[PDB]
Design an enzyme around this catalytic site. Structure first.
Site, PDB file in Angstrom:
ATOM      1  N   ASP A   1       0.882  -1.160   0.000  1.00 59.28           N
ATOM      2  CA  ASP A   1       0.000   0.000   0.000  1.00 59.28           C
ATOM      3  C   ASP A   1       0.923   1.214   0.000  1.00 59.28           C
ATOM      4  O   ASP A   1       1.412   1.636   1.051  1.00 59.28           O
ATOM      5  CB  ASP A   1      -0.887   0.018   1.250  1.00 59.28           C
ATOM      6  CG  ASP A   1      -1.978   1.079   1.167  1.00 59.28           C
ATOM      7  OD1 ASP A   1      -3.075   0.857   1.716  1.00 59.28           O
ATOM      8  OD2 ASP A   1      -1.735   2.134   0.544  1.00 59.28           O
TER       9      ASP A   1
ATOM     10  N   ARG B   1      -0.245   4.557   1.876  1.00 59.07           N
ATOM     11  CA  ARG B   1      -0.030   4.347   3.305  1.00 59.07           C
ATOM     12  C   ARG B   1       1.441   4.347   3.731  1.00 59.07           C
ATOM     13  O   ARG B   1       1.836   5.129   4.595  1.00 59.07           O
ATOM     14  CB  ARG B   1      -0.667   3.029   3.736  1.00 59.07           C
ATOM     15  CG  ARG B   1      -0.341   2.632   5.165  1.00 59.07           C
ATOM     16  CD  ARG B   1      -0.559   1.137   5.391  1.00 59.07           C
ATOM     17  NE  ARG B   1       0.689   0.388   5.268  1.00 59.07           N
ATOM     18  CZ  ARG B   1       1.439   0.012   6.303  1.00 59.07           C
ATOM     19  NH1 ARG B   1       1.065   0.312   7.538  1.00 59.07           N
ATOM     20  NH2 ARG B   1       2.571  -0.658   6.112  1.00 59.07           N
TER      21      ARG B   1
ATOM     22  N   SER C   1       1.979 -10.476  18.040  1.00 57.83           N
ATOM     23  CA  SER C   1       1.934 -11.638  17.155  1.00 57.83           C
ATOM     24  C   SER C   1       3.313 -12.236  16.923  1.00 57.83           C
ATOM     25  O   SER C   1       4.325 -11.649  17.292  1.00 57.83           O
ATOM     26  CB  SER C   1       1.294 -11.284  15.810  1.00 57.83           C
ATOM     27  OG  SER C   1       1.635  -9.974  15.419  1.00 57.83           O
TER      28      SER C   1
ATOM     29  N   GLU D   1       0.158  -3.211  26.529  1.00 54.97           N
ATOM     30  CA  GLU D   1      -0.390  -2.846  27.835  1.00 54.97           C
ATOM     31  C   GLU D   1       0.027  -3.761  28.982  1.00 54.97           C
ATOM     32  O   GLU D   1      -0.431  -3.578  30.111  1.00 54.97           O
ATOM     33  CB  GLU D   1      -1.922  -2.783  27.777  1.00 54.97           C
ATOM     34  CG  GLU D   1      -2.546  -3.789  26.839  1.00 54.97           C
ATOM     35  CD  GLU D   1      -3.091  -3.150  25.582  1.00 54.97           C
ATOM     36  OE1 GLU D   1      -3.924  -2.231  25.694  1.00 54.97           O
ATOM     37  OE2 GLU D   1      -2.688  -3.567  24.481  1.00 54.97           O
TER      38      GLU D   1
ATOM     39  N   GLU E   1       0.854   2.598  13.100  1.00 57.37           N
ATOM     40  CA  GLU E   1      -0.123   2.469  12.032  1.00 57.37           C
ATOM     41  C   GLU E   1      -1.111   1.493  12.644  1.00 57.37           C
ATOM     42  O   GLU E   1      -0.947   0.273  12.545  1.00 57.37           O
ATOM     43  CB  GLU E   1       0.497   1.882  10.774  1.00 57.37           C
ATOM     44  CG  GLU E   1      -0.333   2.154   9.530  1.00 57.37           C
ATOM     45  CD  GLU E   1      -1.530   1.227   9.421  1.00 57.37           C
ATOM     46  OE1 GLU E   1      -2.548   1.475  10.111  1.00 57.37           O
ATOM     47  OE2 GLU E   1      -1.454   0.245   8.643  1.00 57.37           O
TER      48      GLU E   1
ATOM     49  N   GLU F   1     -11.327  -2.850  14.747  1.00 55.93           N
ATOM     50  CA  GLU F   1     -10.213  -3.557  15.389  1.00 55.93           C
ATOM     51  C   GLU F   1      -9.905  -3.007  16.783  1.00 55.93           C
ATOM     52  O   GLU F   1      -9.325  -3.695  17.619  1.00 55.93           O
ATOM     53  CB  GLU F   1      -8.941  -3.480  14.541  1.00 55.93           C
ATOM     54  CG  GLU F   1      -8.816  -4.566  13.486  1.00 55.93           C
ATOM     55  CD  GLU F   1      -7.481  -4.515  12.745  1.00 55.93           C
ATOM     56  OE1 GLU F   1      -6.454  -4.122  13.354  1.00 55.93           O
ATOM     57  OE2 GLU F   1      -7.457  -4.870  11.545  1.00 55.93           O
TER      58      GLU F   1
ATOM     59  N   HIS G   1      -5.663  -0.023   0.736  1.00 53.32           N
ATOM     60  CA  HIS G   1      -6.179  -1.326   1.148  1.00 53.32           C
ATOM     61  C   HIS G   1      -7.408  -1.219   2.049  1.00 53.32           C
ATOM     62  O   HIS G   1      -8.091  -2.213   2.304  1.00 53.32           O
ATOM     63  CB  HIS G   1      -5.079  -2.148   1.837  1.00 53.32           C
ATOM     64  CG  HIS G   1      -4.811  -1.754   3.255  1.00 53.32           C
ATOM     65  ND1 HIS G   1      -4.013  -0.683   3.592  1.00 53.32           N
ATOM     66  CD2 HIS G   1      -5.179  -2.326   4.426  1.00 53.32           C
ATOM     67  CE1 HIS G   1      -3.896  -0.613   4.905  1.00 53.32           C
ATOM     68  NE2 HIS G   1      -4.597  -1.600   5.436  1.00 53.32           N
TER      69      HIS G   1
HETATM   70  N1  LIG Z   1      -2.155  -4.434  21.886  1.00 57.54           N
HETATM   71  C1  LIG Z   1      -1.201  -4.642  20.982  1.00 57.54           C
HETATM   72  N2  LIG Z   1       0.071  -4.804  21.412  1.00 57.54           N
HETATM   73  C2  LIG Z   1       1.026  -5.038  20.504  1.00 57.54           C
HETATM   74  N3  LIG Z   1       0.926  -5.143  19.179  1.00 57.54           N
HETATM   75  C3  LIG Z   1      -0.348  -4.971  18.784  1.00 57.54           C
HETATM   76  C4  LIG Z   1      -1.438  -4.712  19.594  1.00 57.54           C
HETATM   77  N4  LIG Z   1      -2.595  -4.583  18.836  1.00 57.54           N
HETATM   78  C5  LIG Z   1      -2.188  -4.775  17.603  1.00 57.54           C
HETATM   79  N5  LIG Z   1      -0.839  -5.031  17.500  1.00 57.54           N
HETATM   80  C6  LIG Z   1      -0.054  -5.335  16.307  1.00 57.54           C
HETATM   81  O1  LIG Z   1       0.059  -4.161  15.538  1.00 57.54           O
HETATM   82  C7  LIG Z   1       0.124  -4.506  14.126  1.00 57.54           C
HETATM   83  C8  LIG Z   1      -0.891  -3.686  13.374  1.00 57.54           C
HETATM   84  S1  LIG Z   1      -0.289  -3.609  11.665  1.00 57.54           S
HETATM   85  C9  LIG Z   1       1.112  -2.437  11.619  1.00 57.54           C
HETATM   86  C10 LIG Z   1       2.379  -3.234  11.280  1.00 57.54           C
HETATM   87  C11 LIG Z   1       3.591  -2.382  10.885  1.00 57.54           C
HETATM   88  N6  LIG Z   1       3.856  -1.398  11.921  1.00 57.54           N
HETATM   89  C12 LIG Z   1       3.339  -1.700   9.546  1.00 57.54           C
HETATM   90  O2  LIG Z   1       3.225  -0.399   9.514  1.00 57.54           O
HETATM   91  O3  LIG Z   1       3.661  -2.338   8.457  1.00 57.54           O
HETATM   92  C13 LIG Z   1      -0.014  -6.028  14.043  1.00 57.54           C
HETATM   93  O4  LIG Z   1       1.275  -6.637  13.922  1.00 57.54           O
HETATM   94  C14 LIG Z   1      -0.664  -6.385  15.382  1.00 57.54           C
HETATM   95  O5  LIG Z   1      -0.354  -7.701  15.830  1.00 57.54           O
END
Ligand SMILES: Nc1ncnc2c1ncn2[C@@H]1O[C@H](CSCC[C@H](N)C(=O)O)[C@@H](O)[C@H]1O
Length: 321
Positions: A26, A29, A77, A104, A119, A128, A269
């Protein structure tokens, strides 16, 4: 609601590369964040940065290249392990440290941070519920005088006229190969659709329904209600309403950055969110259409949303996934 639990399915979808391939591909973005960071190095040089939800580590690498003294990249993840490898592959281990876990609950190697980047947005901006996590990190870690980016966002609505797309989704079930399947519509209308909207099909000026300042905003502000008025631009039949959002990089910037995910802009996206109306209504150009929209998160699944919309004196409740 977002500070506890787990959400298996959630962090598991972020474990594979596909979803990240899509984000990295993307351009609007990814190049928006690149331009912001690279064009405003004064914001990162010699500072400590926190990347909430680092994914493959792309944003953290941008910051490091800009001059960050130290960058802390966190993700819950399993994609965090592939990031550990990517940072080594690029010889950035002495600047970017990685941590696996929920922002957290994990233990940071520092007390406060100067800048926070992330992001975190989803469809219709809030799908989400990740902004909640970003606000949490802001409260606990941002240093007095620090900044969070992107700092400002907005959500808007636009009237639409597309009778064929309406028929394709609803009227379709009236006659399937000679058979009546009309009972199917009862489960179709209430679902919001994420899809690209033909700009030639917009029949009203857009209207803002929400403004967010990541510095003054709070978690309770993410569940709102808003009255709006759409100003008609064409005499046509109104079949649906479309929602989208815009992102802004502004505080302390000598080079500000902005991007839109609206129908008149380059595709992203995120596409756009569509609320089909059960009963399309005739509209005349110059007309003013009063309405009301309420957005709330599903109490049974805090990562999904519930939208109540009123237009033409008719109310409907939709769900986003
Ligand atoms: N509470 C949380 N603690 C840590 N990571 C989190 C989260 N909630 C979402 N994420 C993570 O944040 C990501 C959102 S996508 C952003 C991914 C990357 N920074 C990019 O710009 O390409 C995912 O990997 C998801 O697992």
């Amino acid at each position: 609601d977002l500070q506890e639990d787990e959400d298996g399915v959630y962090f598991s979808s972020y474990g594979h590369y596909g979803i990240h391939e899509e984000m990295l591909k993307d351009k609007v973005r990814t190049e928006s964040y690149r331009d912001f960071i690279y064009q405003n190095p004064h914001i990162f040089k010699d500072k400590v940065v926190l990347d909430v939800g680092c994914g493959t580590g792309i944003l953290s690498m941008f910051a490091a290249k800009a001059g960050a003294k130290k960058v802390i990249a966190v993700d819950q993840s399993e994609i965090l392990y592939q990031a550990m490898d990517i940072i080594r592959l690029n010889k950035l281990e002495d600047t970017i440290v990685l941590i696996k876990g929920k922002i957290e609950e994990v233990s940071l190697p520092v007390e406060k941070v100067d800048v926070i980047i992330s992001e975190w947005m989803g469809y219709f901006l809030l799908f989400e519920s990740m902004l909640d996590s970003v606000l949490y990190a802001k409260s606990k870690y941002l240093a007095k005088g620090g900044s969070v980016y992107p700092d400002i966002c907005t959500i808007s609505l636009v009237a639409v006229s597309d009778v064929s797309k309406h028929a394709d989704r609803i009227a379709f079930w009236d006659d399937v190969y000679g058979f009546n399947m009309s009972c199917m519509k009862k489960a179709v209308i209430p679902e919001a659709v994420v899809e690209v909207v033909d700009h030639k099909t917009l029949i009203s000026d857009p209207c803002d329904i929400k403004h967010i300042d990541c510095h003054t905003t709070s978690i309770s502000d993410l569940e709102f209600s808003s009255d709006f008025t759409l100003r008609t631009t064409k005499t046509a039949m109104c079949t649906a309403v479309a929602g989208y959002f815009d992102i802004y990089f502004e505080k302390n910037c000598h080079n500000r950055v902005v991007f839109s995910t609206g129908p008149q802009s380059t595709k992203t996206h995120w596409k756009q969110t569509i609320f089909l109306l059960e009963k399309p209504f005739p509209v005349k150009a110059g007309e003013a259409l009063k309405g009301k929209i309420t957005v709330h998160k599903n109490k049974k699944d805090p990562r999904s949303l519930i939208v109540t919309l009123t237009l033409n004196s008719s109310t409907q409740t939709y769900s986003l996934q």
